[PDB]
C-alpha cells in the first residue's frame, strides 16, 4: 500500500493511494449524504455524519467501513496496512475519545473539515480493538490524512501512545514507523535526477550508455521501505523540475512505478500480490477518481452530482472490465 | 527510448510492443499502408512497394512513411529502439549485400516478410547503410526487435564487424550495451526470489518481514537500459511461472509501467524531462494496434482489418494526448 | 566507526572497534592501575578507579579520556560517533547520576565489573555536556558495552531519556538510533549465504558465473547504515557455519570488510576518511590487541604484565610503522 | 578466486598481486627458480629451460613447478585467475601456433619474457592447449593478468574464436564474465561520488547525511566477480585521484581487503566456506614477493635478490598459516 499527496499546476490538491492485496474485500465506492445515522448491529454504537462522505469500502449489516475516502469539505483519509509496530488497546481507556479500528476512517471524515480540526481532537484520542462484527477482526492499520491547505499528517498508534506526525514528505507506505522512513531517506541524499554523462577513471573513460545514471542506487523491489523511497523521490523530482506540468495523470505515473505486478510478489500462501486499485481524490472538486488492475481507465465519481441532503447510501460497482477506445 | 516486450496470452495470442522514452515530440501519428502501395522517397528517389499491409507508429516526411514500431497483416511485428554506441553503420554501400537505409529498415521488414524465419534468412546477406531520409534529418543510432505469431523473437544489432541476429529467449529488450551483454548481466540476479521470505533467524535476534516482496530485494530501481532490462525480464518470467493462465492485454501494460519513466526524475543534460511518451501493444494474430500515452492512459485500439487492405491511400490517425475520463455519475 | 562483539571457539569473548576518522587525535594506549585518583584541572571533578583500566585514548592536563578500552574484570566499552540524534543536557539534572560526556567511558570501566552492574547504575543516570577543558568541546557519542557473559548493551541518550538497548546483534555503528538499525535488518531477510547455482528463466537458463550470488543486494558503501548491515550478516554467517573456527584473526576479517580505504571516502573539507586503527579486546585475558592503517600487524598489550597495584599511568606509543617478516 | 591489482607507489615503484579466493588448500608454497634451470615434466616429457629467475606462489607435482601467481627478475609479473565459462581450450594441438598447456602458461610468460610488450608479440601466434600436468589432475579454467615496470597491464583470455589480449587501463581483474563485459559494466556506476553529499532539500523536508560516504551509495557489497570488480576499480581510482602521493605497500592491501571473502558468508554448493586464502603483492622493480594469509595477516617478504640467481636448485618457502602477534609488553 502506497499513499500520495500532490498539488496541481492550478492550485488543486490530489490525495489518493495504491491498494496492494492478494485478494478481494467486496469493495465498492460508497456515498454517504449529510446527517446520516449509522448503527452498528453488533455493538449498538452510533454515528451521525456532520459532512457528506465519498470513498472506497464495504458494508457489513448496513454499516459502512472505508479503506480510503474524502468528505465535502475537502478532507481526505486513507487507511494503509501497519503489520507489527501497531498497538491497539483491547478495551476502552477512560478520559480518552475511544475509536474502534474499523471506524476510524469514517470518524475522521464525518466529523471534521480540516487537518487542524483532526489534530486537535486526536490529542485526547485512542484506537480500541473492537471488531465491526464478532468474527470480523480488525486489521493492522495506520492512516494518512490531508486537506485543501496542502498539509498532511500521519496517524500511528504504537505501544507508547497515539502519534500524529507532520508529513512533509507527502507520501506514506507501511511498516516500519513513519520516523523510520523519514530517517531512511537520508541514506539516499546522493541520488541525482540530472544525467551523469561521463566519468574519468584515470586512463579509462567511462561514458553513460543511457539515461537515468544519476539514480543508480534506487531500490527496485516492492517492499514498503523501497516503495517509500521511490515514491518520495519521484514526487520530489516532479515538484522541483516540472511543477507547472502537474495534472491528474501525473498522480498515476508516480504510483504506477511502485505498483505490484502479477506474479512477481508471491505470498507464503502462494497468491499473487497486486495493486488492485489506484484511487485519486481531487479534494477541492469532491471527485473520486480511480482505476483498477483489470481496468486502467480513470473512473470519476462526483459527490456534488449527488443529493448531499439525501436519505440513503449510494454505492457504485467496482469497475474490473477493461475499457478500450476504438479509433477506427 | 526504450523497452520492448513480447508476451503470450491465456488464449494463445501473441502480444508485441514497446515503451518509447524520449524527452520530446517527433510529430508522430499511427500510419497505415495497404498492399501494393508504392512508397517513393523524394530526396533519394528510392522505391518501396509493399507486399503486405502495414500498421504502426511513425512519422511522414515528404509523403514518405518511417516507423518507430509496427506490424503487418501476417502477424509480424518490428520495433526500433535506441542504441547509442556499439553500433556502426556503413557510411557508403557494400558490394554484394542487401543495402538497407537506417530509417527504412523497419518498413523493409514489415513490407517484405511474413515470418521471423523469413526475416532471418533475408538478413544473412543484409547490411544497414547510413543514408538519411532527407538532407537535414540524420539517422538515429538504432537496434531492432522482431517477433511473430509463433512466439519467437529476434534481436538485430549491427556492430563494426557484422550484422548480428540474436535469438531472444528473454522476450525483452532495452538499449546499450549489446544484447549479449544484457543476457550475461541477468546471471548476477540468480538469487532473486518471487516468493516471500517471512523471517530470518539472526542468532539471538529474530528478523521478521516488514511487508511483501522481500525476495526481490537487490533489484535495481533506476531507469538505465540495464536496470530496466533486468526488471522487465524477471517481472515477465514471474508472470509466466505463476500466472500463465491470466495473461491478457492489460498485463502487458502493468509490466511496462514499472520501467516507465516519470516526469522530473530522468533529466537530460539539456535539462529536459525524459518520459515514456507512449506505450504500444500489437496483437499480432488479430492485427489490432493498442496504445496509450503519457497524457492519456486509456488504451486506444486501431484495427487494420477494419480498413480496406487493398486500398490506394496511406491512412493516418491522430496521436491521442487528451486524457479520457469515464464519468460514472 | 564500527563496533563488534564475538565469541571464540574456546569460550573466550572478543570485543573491539574500527575507528573511522580523517584526522589524528593524539591517541595512545593508556594503562591505569587499581585505586588511581584522577583530578580534572578545569572543573575540579574527581574519580578514583576501583578497577584497573586498559584502552585507547588521550591525556589532557594529566586527565585520561578514552575512545575504547577494558578493565581487569573483563568489562569492555567503546565510544562511537553519534552525529544528530544525540542529546546532552547543558547542566546537571537533580537526582540523576550526572556524567560528563568525555568521562563516560572511564566511569563505566573504573566503577563496574559486569554489564548487569552497569545496567542498574544507568537507570538513574544522565549525560551532561561539560567539556574536559574549556576550549575542548565534547563529541557526539554513543557507547557499546560488553562483558565476559557474552551479553552486550547499547547506551544512547536521546532528547527523551537515556536508553539502554540489549544488543542481540553483536554490533554497533553510528546514526540513526539503534532501534532504527535493528528494524533496517528486516529489509535484508532475503539474503542467502549459500550459493545459488542456476535460475530457470523460461527458455533461457541463467547460471551463476561466480561465488556469492546469494548475497546480491548487500550494500557496498561505507555509510553507518550499510556498514551496520554488512558487519551484522558477516557475523551471523560465521556463527552459523563456522563457529568452531572463530579465533582472534576472524575478528579482523569481519571488520576489514567495513574498513574505510584512502581516497574513496572524502569529507567536505577534502580529507580522506580512514579506518585509522582496529582494536580487539580479549576480555577474559585482559589483552588489548590492535593494528593501525599504516601497520597491519596485530599488536598486543597485556594488562596482567603490568603492576595492577601501581602508582602511575603507563602509556604505549601508537604504532604506525609497518612491520614485515623477512622470510629469507 | 580472485582479484588482481596493479598499483604505482609515491616513489614510482610498481606493485602487482592478487587475492586467492578458494574454499580449500592446494598444498602451495612459494617457489623459486634460478636462471637456466631445466624443468622436466615427468608425465609428458616436455622441457622448459628458464631464461630469467622466477619467484611466486604455486605447487610442485613430480619435481615440476606450476604457478598461481608470480614474477621474474626483470620485473614482469603474471597472475592466474579463475574463469568458469567463456573459456575454450583447444582439446588437441593447433598447427602453426605456439601450443602452451594451461598449467604451464604462467611459467611460460615469466621464464621467457622480460616485458609486457615482449609478451604481447609472442602471444599473437599463441594458443592454449588442454594438456594436464599429470594424468589425474585436470586443468582449471583460467584467465591471466600480466604487468611490468612500465605501469602497463594486459588481460589474456582465450575464447572459442581466438586468444584475446586486452589492454588493462583499469588495473584490476576478477573472474567471469569476460574482461570486455566488466569494462562495459563500469559505465553503470558513473554516478558514484567519492565526495560527501552533506544534504538534500526534499521540498519541505531537509535531509542531512547521517554519516560519511553518502556519494558511494549504490555500490554493491557482495562477493561476486562483477561486484568485486566494480569496488576494486573505483577504490583504486579514488586513491589515485585524491592520494597519489601516499600510495605504498599497505595501500595495496587495504584495497583488496574490501573485496576479501570472510569465513561463513560465501558458501559453496558443497557447503564449504570460500575464503581469501592469501593476498600476494609483488614489488616488480625490487623483486620482493610480499604476502599474507587468512590465518596470518602479517606481510611476509621473500626477496629473490637475496638468493643466488645463478643457482642449480629450485628453492621453496613454507606457506605461513600461523598468526604473528607483536607483544608490546
mmCIF file of C-alpha atoms in Angstrom, chain A residues 80-300:
data_model
loop_
_atom_site.group_PDB
_atom_site.id
_atom_site.type_symbol
_atom_site.label_atom_id
_atom_site.label_comp_id
_atom_site.label_asym_id
_atom_site.label_seq_id
_atom_site.Cartn_x
_atom_site.Cartn_y
_atom_site.Cartn_z
ATOM 1 C CA UNK A 80 -2.869 1.621 4.951
ATOM 2 C CA UNK A 81 -1.521 -1.655 6.407
ATOM 3 C CA UNK A 82 0.708 -1.475 9.515
ATOM 4 C CA UNK A 83 1.790 -5.106 10.334
ATOM 5 C CA UNK A 84 3.933 -5.338 13.505
ATOM 6 C CA UNK A 85 4.553 -1.913 15.098
ATOM 7 C CA UNK A 86 0.844 -1.141 15.604
ATOM 8 C CA UNK A 87 -0.772 -1.424 19.053
ATOM 9 C CA UNK A 88 -4.483 -1.257 19.893
ATOM 10 C CA UNK A 89 -5.994 -1.457 23.375
ATOM 11 C CA UNK A 90 -8.412 -4.391 23.780
ATOM 12 C CA UNK A 91 -10.819 -2.281 25.870
ATOM 13 C CA UNK A 92 -11.757 1.413 26.185
ATOM 14 C CA UNK A 93 -9.495 3.836 28.063
ATOM 15 C CA UNK A 94 -11.158 6.326 30.435
ATOM 16 C CA UNK A 95 -10.880 10.039 29.582
ATOM 17 C CA UNK A 96 -9.748 9.367 26.006
ATOM 18 C CA UNK A 97 -12.030 9.586 22.961
ATOM 19 C CA UNK A 98 -12.048 5.861 22.130
ATOM 20 C CA UNK A 99 -12.368 4.967 18.434
ATOM 21 C CA UNK A 100 -12.904 1.430 17.037
ATOM 22 C CA UNK A 101 -10.287 0.434 14.425
ATOM 23 C CA UNK A 102 -12.790 -0.301 11.623
ATOM 24 C CA UNK A 103 -14.480 3.056 12.249
ATOM 25 C CA UNK A 104 -11.501 5.447 12.483
ATOM 26 C CA UNK A 105 -11.553 6.487 8.816
ATOM 27 C CA UNK A 106 -15.269 7.360 8.850
ATOM 28 C CA UNK A 107 -14.859 9.153 12.210
ATOM 29 C CA UNK A 108 -12.244 11.475 10.670
ATOM 30 C CA UNK A 109 -14.292 12.195 7.532
ATOM 31 C CA UNK A 110 -17.749 12.517 9.102
ATOM 32 C CA UNK A 111 -16.837 14.872 11.960
ATOM 33 C CA UNK A 112 -14.105 17.227 10.724
ATOM 34 C CA UNK A 113 -13.412 19.649 7.866
ATOM 35 C CA UNK A 114 -9.670 20.340 8.122
ATOM 36 C CA UNK A 115 -6.389 18.657 9.091
ATOM 37 C CA UNK A 116 -6.101 21.107 12.016
ATOM 38 C CA UNK A 117 -9.546 20.125 13.326
ATOM 39 C CA UNK A 118 -8.438 16.458 13.309
ATOM 40 C CA UNK A 119 -5.100 17.281 15.011
ATOM 41 C CA UNK A 120 -6.887 18.868 17.988
ATOM 42 C CA UNK A 121 -9.385 16.030 18.523
ATOM 43 C CA UNK A 122 -6.593 13.439 18.247
ATOM 44 C CA UNK A 123 -4.749 14.786 21.299
ATOM 45 C CA UNK A 124 -7.183 13.015 23.593
ATOM 46 C CA UNK A 125 -7.876 10.041 21.315
ATOM 47 C CA UNK A 126 -7.262 6.280 21.423
ATOM 48 C CA UNK A 127 -7.756 3.392 18.979
ATOM 49 C CA UNK A 128 -9.592 0.446 20.567
ATOM 50 C CA UNK A 129 -9.527 -3.105 19.145
ATOM 51 C CA UNK A 130 -13.284 -3.699 18.862
ATOM 52 C CA UNK A 131 -14.364 -5.596 15.706
ATOM 53 C CA UNK A 132 -17.138 -4.421 13.342
ATOM 54 C CA UNK A 133 -18.830 -7.805 13.799
ATOM 55 C CA UNK A 134 -17.840 -10.597 16.207
ATOM 56 C CA UNK A 135 -15.982 -12.790 13.693
ATOM 57 C CA UNK A 136 -14.655 -9.950 11.518
ATOM 58 C CA UNK A 137 -11.341 -8.989 13.199
ATOM 59 C CA UNK A 138 -9.704 -5.586 12.713
ATOM 60 C CA UNK A 139 -6.629 -5.226 10.525
ATOM 61 C CA UNK A 140 -3.289 -3.649 11.412
ATOM 62 C CA UNK A 141 -3.660 -0.074 10.139
ATOM 63 C CA UNK A 142 -2.130 3.407 10.050
ATOM 64 C CA UNK A 143 -3.650 6.467 8.373
ATOM 65 C CA UNK A 144 -2.622 9.388 6.179
ATOM 66 C CA UNK A 145 -4.846 12.477 6.369
ATOM 67 C CA UNK A 146 -4.691 15.513 4.060
ATOM 68 C CA UNK A 147 -6.838 18.561 3.192
ATOM 69 C CA UNK A 148 -7.100 21.563 0.837
ATOM 70 C CA UNK A 149 -4.352 23.525 2.645
ATOM 71 C CA UNK A 150 -1.747 21.163 1.172
ATOM 72 C CA UNK A 151 -0.751 19.875 4.604
ATOM 73 C CA UNK A 152 -0.748 16.181 5.539
ATOM 74 C CA UNK A 153 -0.407 14.251 8.807
ATOM 75 C CA UNK A 154 0.264 10.596 9.738
ATOM 76 C CA UNK A 155 -1.630 8.742 12.470
ATOM 77 C CA UNK A 156 0.244 5.819 14.037
ATOM 78 C CA UNK A 157 -0.669 4.260 17.384
ATOM 79 C CA UNK A 158 2.283 2.459 18.966
ATOM 80 C CA UNK A 159 2.589 0.750 22.364
ATOM 81 C CA UNK A 160 3.540 4.091 23.956
ATOM 82 C CA UNK A 161 0.812 6.445 22.684
ATOM 83 C CA UNK A 162 -1.080 7.819 19.662
ATOM 84 C CA UNK A 163 1.366 9.608 17.341
ATOM 85 C CA UNK A 164 0.450 12.400 14.925
ATOM 86 C CA UNK A 165 3.404 13.113 12.607
ATOM 87 C CA UNK A 166 3.559 16.059 10.214
ATOM 88 C CA UNK A 167 4.001 14.553 6.744
ATOM 89 C CA UNK A 168 6.351 16.890 4.864
ATOM 90 C CA UNK A 169 7.296 14.024 2.535
ATOM 91 C CA UNK A 170 3.812 13.856 1.001
ATOM 92 C CA UNK A 171 3.779 10.042 0.985
ATOM 93 C CA UNK A 172 3.005 7.042 3.196
ATOM 94 C CA UNK A 173 3.579 3.297 2.846
ATOM 95 C CA UNK A 174 3.698 0.558 5.513
ATOM 96 C CA UNK A 175 5.908 -0.707 8.370
ATOM 97 C CA UNK A 176 8.227 0.344 9.975
ATOM 98 C CA UNK A 177 7.052 3.560 11.673
ATOM 99 C CA UNK A 178 6.954 6.923 9.855
ATOM 100 C CA UNK A 179 10.012 8.347 11.656
ATOM 101 C CA UNK A 180 11.988 5.286 10.492
ATOM 102 C CA UNK A 181 11.167 6.027 6.836
ATOM 103 C CA UNK A 182 11.966 9.754 7.119
ATOM 104 C CA UNK A 183 15.361 8.830 8.584
ATOM 105 C CA UNK A 184 15.867 6.183 5.876
ATOM 106 C CA UNK A 185 15.555 8.967 3.282
ATOM 107 C CA UNK A 186 18.899 10.397 4.463
ATOM 108 C CA UNK A 187 20.620 7.260 3.164
ATOM 109 C CA UNK A 188 19.710 8.386 -0.360
ATOM 110 C CA UNK A 189 20.937 12.016 -0.434
ATOM 111 C CA UNK A 190 23.452 11.019 -3.133
ATOM 112 C CA UNK A 191 20.709 10.484 -5.726
ATOM 113 C CA UNK A 192 20.694 12.838 -8.714
ATOM 114 C CA UNK A 193 17.898 13.419 -11.227
ATOM 115 C CA UNK A 194 20.336 15.032 -13.676
ATOM 116 C CA UNK A 195 22.149 12.852 -16.212
ATOM 117 C CA UNK A 196 25.757 11.936 -15.436
ATOM 118 C CA UNK A 197 27.292 11.818 -18.965
ATOM 119 C CA UNK A 198 30.883 10.717 -18.276
ATOM 120 C CA UNK A 199 33.359 9.627 -15.591
ATOM 121 C CA UNK A 200 37.148 9.968 -15.793
ATOM 122 C CA UNK A 201 38.508 6.704 -14.374
ATOM 123 C CA UNK A 202 42.180 7.548 -14.957
ATOM 124 C CA UNK A 203 43.343 6.315 -18.368
ATOM 125 C CA UNK A 204 39.939 4.694 -18.959
ATOM 126 C CA UNK A 205 36.976 6.892 -19.901
ATOM 127 C CA UNK A 206 33.531 5.818 -18.708
ATOM 128 C CA UNK A 207 30.572 7.085 -20.720
ATOM 129 C CA UNK A 208 26.891 6.720 -19.818
ATOM 130 C CA UNK A 209 25.153 4.273 -22.161
ATOM 131 C CA UNK A 210 21.648 5.528 -21.348
ATOM 132 C CA UNK A 211 19.555 7.990 -19.355
ATOM 133 C CA UNK A 212 18.955 7.878 -15.598
ATOM 134 C CA UNK A 213 22.521 7.146 -14.466
ATOM 135 C CA UNK A 214 22.262 9.613 -11.573
ATOM 136 C CA UNK A 215 19.622 7.447 -9.881
ATOM 137 C CA UNK A 216 21.719 4.256 -9.699
ATOM 138 C CA UNK A 217 21.279 3.041 -6.127
ATOM 139 C CA UNK A 218 17.486 3.328 -6.093
ATOM 140 C CA UNK A 219 15.795 0.110 -4.860
ATOM 141 C CA UNK A 220 13.533 -1.620 -7.411
ATOM 142 C CA UNK A 221 11.710 -4.078 -5.145
ATOM 143 C CA UNK A 222 8.133 -3.750 -3.865
ATOM 144 C CA UNK A 223 8.773 -3.779 -0.109
ATOM 145 C CA UNK A 224 7.210 -0.972 1.973
ATOM 146 C CA UNK A 225 10.634 0.655 2.510
ATOM 147 C CA UNK A 226 11.778 0.625 -1.137
ATOM 148 C CA UNK A 227 8.382 1.842 -2.339
ATOM 149 C CA UNK A 228 8.557 4.664 0.222
ATOM 150 C CA UNK A 229 11.952 5.652 -1.215
ATOM 151 C CA UNK A 230 10.923 5.589 -4.892
ATOM 152 C CA UNK A 231 7.611 7.415 -4.436
ATOM 153 C CA UNK A 232 9.197 10.144 -2.268
ATOM 154 C CA UNK A 233 11.984 10.970 -4.739
ATOM 155 C CA UNK A 234 9.779 10.659 -7.840
ATOM 156 C CA UNK A 235 7.425 13.161 -6.174
ATOM 157 C CA UNK A 236 10.295 15.495 -5.243
ATOM 158 C CA UNK A 237 11.724 15.417 -8.781
ATOM 159 C CA UNK A 238 8.378 16.419 -10.300
ATOM 160 C CA UNK A 239 7.853 19.365 -7.908
ATOM 161 C CA UNK A 240 11.404 20.642 -8.458
ATOM 162 C CA UNK A 241 11.579 20.410 -12.245
ATOM 163 C CA UNK A 242 8.024 20.165 -13.605
ATOM 164 C CA UNK A 243 5.677 21.893 -11.132
ATOM 165 C CA UNK A 244 3.871 23.691 -13.978
ATOM 166 C CA UNK A 245 3.008 20.359 -15.622
ATOM 167 C CA UNK A 246 1.368 18.583 -12.671
ATOM 168 C CA UNK A 247 -2.151 17.469 -13.576
ATOM 169 C CA UNK A 248 -4.371 14.464 -12.741
ATOM 170 C CA UNK A 249 -2.455 11.866 -14.788
ATOM 171 C CA UNK A 250 0.909 12.654 -13.131
ATOM 172 C CA UNK A 251 -0.509 11.255 -9.876
ATOM 173 C CA UNK A 252 -0.909 7.858 -11.558
ATOM 174 C CA UNK A 253 2.542 7.903 -13.215
ATOM 175 C CA UNK A 254 4.241 8.208 -9.817
ATOM 176 C CA UNK A 255 2.172 5.438 -8.203
ATOM 177 C CA UNK A 256 2.437 3.102 -11.216
ATOM 178 C CA UNK A 257 6.191 2.903 -10.573
ATOM 179 C CA UNK A 258 5.516 1.388 -7.126
ATOM 180 C CA UNK A 259 2.574 -0.749 -8.292
ATOM 181 C CA UNK A 260 2.748 -4.525 -7.782
ATOM 182 C CA UNK A 261 2.659 -6.654 -10.952
ATOM 183 C CA UNK A 262 1.056 -10.127 -11.186
ATOM 184 C CA UNK A 263 3.489 -12.981 -10.496
ATOM 185 C CA UNK A 264 6.436 -11.026 -9.075
ATOM 186 C CA UNK A 265 5.176 -10.652 -5.493
ATOM 187 C CA UNK A 266 4.100 -14.052 -4.152
ATOM 188 C CA UNK A 267 2.808 -14.542 -0.596
ATOM 189 C CA UNK A 268 3.597 -17.604 1.561
ATOM 190 C CA UNK A 269 0.077 -18.813 0.683
ATOM 191 C CA UNK A 270 1.228 -18.758 -2.985
ATOM 192 C CA UNK A 271 -1.056 -15.888 -4.046
ATOM 193 C CA UNK A 272 -0.032 -13.030 -6.342
ATOM 194 C CA UNK A 273 0.005 -9.680 -4.532
ATOM 195 C CA UNK A 274 -1.395 -6.980 -6.836
ATOM 196 C CA UNK A 275 -2.067 -3.267 -6.909
ATOM 197 C CA UNK A 276 -5.793 -3.988 -7.128
ATOM 198 C CA UNK A 277 -6.840 -0.347 -7.497
ATOM 199 C CA UNK A 278 -5.372 3.161 -7.546
ATOM 200 C CA UNK A 279 -7.549 5.997 -6.248
ATOM 201 C CA UNK A 280 -7.025 9.756 -6.512
ATOM 202 C CA UNK A 281 -9.213 12.351 -4.806
ATOM 203 C CA UNK A 282 -9.479 15.914 -6.079
ATOM 204 C CA UNK A 283 -10.214 17.457 -2.691
ATOM 205 C CA UNK A 284 -11.464 20.861 -3.905
ATOM 206 C CA UNK A 285 -13.840 19.414 -6.506
ATOM 207 C CA UNK A 286 -15.075 16.423 -4.467
ATOM 208 C CA UNK A 287 -14.331 13.893 -7.201
ATOM 209 C CA UNK A 288 -13.211 10.328 -6.512
ATOM 210 C CA UNK A 289 -11.024 9.224 -9.413
ATOM 211 C CA UNK A 290 -9.878 5.591 -9.517
ATOM 212 C CA UNK A 291 -8.747 2.752 -11.770
ATOM 213 C CA UNK A 292 -8.271 -0.978 -11.144
ATOM 214 C CA UNK A 293 -5.828 -3.728 -12.143
ATOM 215 C CA UNK A 294 -8.247 -5.132 -14.745
ATOM 216 C CA UNK A 295 -9.426 -1.724 -15.997
ATOM 217 C CA UNK A 296 -6.848 1.086 -16.185
ATOM 218 C CA UNK A 297 -9.114 3.890 -17.443
ATOM 219 C CA UNK A 298 -9.677 6.535 -14.777
ATOM 220 C CA UNK A 299 -13.246 6.396 -13.462
ATOM 221 C CA UNK A 300 -14.715 9.509 -11.833
#
